[PDB]
Amino acid sequence: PSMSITRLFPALLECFGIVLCGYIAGRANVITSTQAKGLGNFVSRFALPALLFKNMVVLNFSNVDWSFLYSILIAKASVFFIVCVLTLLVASPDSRFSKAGLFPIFATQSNDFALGYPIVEALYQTTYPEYLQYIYLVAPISLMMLNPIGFIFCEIQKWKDTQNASQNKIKIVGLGLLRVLQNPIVFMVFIGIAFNFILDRKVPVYVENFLDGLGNSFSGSALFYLGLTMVGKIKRLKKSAFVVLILLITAKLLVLPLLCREMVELLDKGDSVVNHTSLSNYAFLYGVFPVAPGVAIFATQFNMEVEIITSGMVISTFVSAPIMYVSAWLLTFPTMDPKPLAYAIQNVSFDISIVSLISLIWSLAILLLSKKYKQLPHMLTTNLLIAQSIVCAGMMIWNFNFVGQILVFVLLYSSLYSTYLWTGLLAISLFLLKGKHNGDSIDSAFFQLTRHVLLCLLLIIGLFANLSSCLWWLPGRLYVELQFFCAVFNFGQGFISFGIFG
Amino acid sequence: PSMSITRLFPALLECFGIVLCGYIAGRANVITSTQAKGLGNFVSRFALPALLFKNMVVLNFSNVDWSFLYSILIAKASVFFIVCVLTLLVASPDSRFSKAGLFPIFATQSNDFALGYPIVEALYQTTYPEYLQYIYLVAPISLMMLNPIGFIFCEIQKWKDTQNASQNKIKIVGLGLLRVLQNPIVFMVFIGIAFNFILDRKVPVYVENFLDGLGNSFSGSALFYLGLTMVGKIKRLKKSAFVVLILLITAKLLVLPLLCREMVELLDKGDSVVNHTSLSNYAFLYGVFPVAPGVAIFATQFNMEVEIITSGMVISTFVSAPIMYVSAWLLTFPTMDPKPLAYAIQNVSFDISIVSLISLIWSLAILLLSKKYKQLPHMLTTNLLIAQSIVCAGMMIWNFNFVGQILVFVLLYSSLYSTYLWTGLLAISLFLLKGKHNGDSIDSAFFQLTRHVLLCLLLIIGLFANLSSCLWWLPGRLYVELQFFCAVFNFGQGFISFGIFG
């Protein structure tokens, strides 16, 4: 296997569990916003620059696959160019430059170090250890190349807003370029590259432990700070702003990884098909990383589009977790024989039902302890979420004799079909308010008002799959992929119930 | 070699370099006191409990040397008992219980996790990997055993101060005992021990990455928070309080490690002399760890003796660094043949001259940029510190041909003897204000007012040592040990100049 895909769910649990820890700490006022800045300044000014310096000094530039960098970088430049040109065409005259600066940086700049690296490490540390290098190459080179352009557009806006001024272009270009130079990521990569040549790849033995201590502290500390900064950030956006945010998160989490995968396949004219495939799959995985928290920091510094950029960075972080898991497994399935593939979809189902059961217990606990379950539409919703919890427990049981199998099936498919029933009954309440057994097998199938609208929309968008999937077993490539998307939905429907009511 | 003693200086540079980073960040107001609490709450409530749980679940209790635990624990109980009984006898009636509570906890509770573990790891990870277990065993079991007694004395004081009350003993005992149970170290060790039995030693694969991320972030993050909390903490103490602080830091950093070493040699009646010697040396290294930052937190919570305890914890942290380095090398020398031992003292000299040169550059930079060097006694002091910087550079050169050797000697010993000259001339200003070459060898020898009083008081110790050393080589065990203490002084005299004027 090219990806150690089994290691991805443990790594996602590290990543988004530590982000959830920081979010819980901020929500519980264990760490207030003014206290969080100590972790943020530790992370950004000490742990991250030490991690960057360490890895840049160690880096074997004579063994880097430059065509991977070129590919991801051209893919990011493509999404940057598309989002920028399109924004200048679509946006209102008084704010087209603040948007044309921050929207392209949003759509291209990844959460490479905090979230990307634990995931790339998990997937590729053993199978393709060279892939861990390109986190430290891509992320800064792409800030260096793309961010000054977006900063230049924000400086143009700052100039334009300052209507009493009429000054010349070179201060605009210089000030935006100076802004990327002042980023620790950029200057520590220049410094680390310099010391890579000076020291060879060898960190001095007496400095090594110090850089290890700071660098190794970045991962958890940065994920936790990301959690803290996500508290109270999703402000209720206008309809247009929410559409723009959806477009930009789609640019980052769908268009960019598709273009990354395509660019690798265009430019990586090396021979080995497995190396080419794993590099293509890594390019996709790279594109799926959420928006860098630094973009929200730039937006705060300029005082421009900060609502959309912060909300979008938070939502991108959350939305990346399932997209990353789903994408990586989906890219691994082409390499798997049908028996390991059936195993794999049950592993996927177990993983999603773990997170969904946790999310459902929390959602139910809120709706029950708040006693909201007696009001409308919460009266129906709590039925749906109990039924979803029974679904997830059914899968965690099914992951671990013949009589138990038949019993656990009826638990799972009475509650599953019931969750579809409640999905429809719940949607309707918003409108009013306004074949044979097959025991010798591993898979199981073949035997408030506005927020509630969003839940029923997403759940109905999910519903397609287990409809088709069972009449089609009564096949081929798209069946095992939609078997996966209906398993994802069967067990992960509660995660959407949670993401909206938690 | 029982200790990988060469790894200790890199580890100390990690430990006290990251502490110095946090101190620099707090001094520069990169992180204000109110911002530092975010790092503190991350460290104490997430990264430390995850580290504890991880290591306690992994722990092979069927392979622990219980006699080491018994030894360190009885040594700590001995120092606790001595400091407690002696404090109740010596202290003034109105505060004898707050002191009898916090002074014994001070004298016994070590900075085990932030500072102790990187050092034990460095020294013993390869040679005696089992020694890393006892950090996680000793530290909580000693909180559990000794801290409730000291808390009980602080509760007795709180009761006594609350003169309108006359309540019964069982609330006092229960409330102090509840205070140790509420400590994350204690409850996560109970929880981790429980899950060690439940899970065997095997952390669940999907929880493992999460615990790794949080736990691995503790080391650097806790050292940095320790640095932040050390900013502005050494308040100018009374003469009596400074003597008491010196006695308590001597209890922690001298009496406790001596008793730990003795207790191991009393109780470790196993056979192998090298295992016995390395365990004895580890027991000493364990006793040398500075005071736990938690003691200052207890003192803040009780609002008792907080000045002495905080100052003492900061000074203990700083004083531990040289004592730890000096002690570990000194304990390694008995195992070394005279040629590796001569090598070793030059390695020691290089290490101390690195830190001292850094410290001297900073000290000089302050005295020069402040232009204090024109006032008294700074006029002489800046001469001393230039001469000390030339000494340290002389050693770093001597660590890396025959003509260069003769040149670098005269640099080193003109400046060394001159630093002794200025040591005397400087002390006097305070009172007024109020043999043959031997080129075939590796060692070099054988060819404000109140703060200034403290500086000159300690360089007297040093004038002493190098005196004896050369006239005697013009031998035996105490000579190679004092050869080391005069090398320590020759090159580390600038570090004392820095610790007082920086």
Ligand SMILES: O=C(O)Cc1c[nH]c2ccccc12
């Ligand atoms: O986007 C990144 O991965 C870099 C980064 C810079 N400052 C951060 C704070 C928290 C989490 C990640 C980062």
Ligand SMILES: O=C(O)Cc1c[nH]c2ccccc12
């Ligand atoms: O004393 C220890 O090593 C434990 C510890 C608990 N809270 C701390 C904060 C900073 C550094 C260390 C600790």
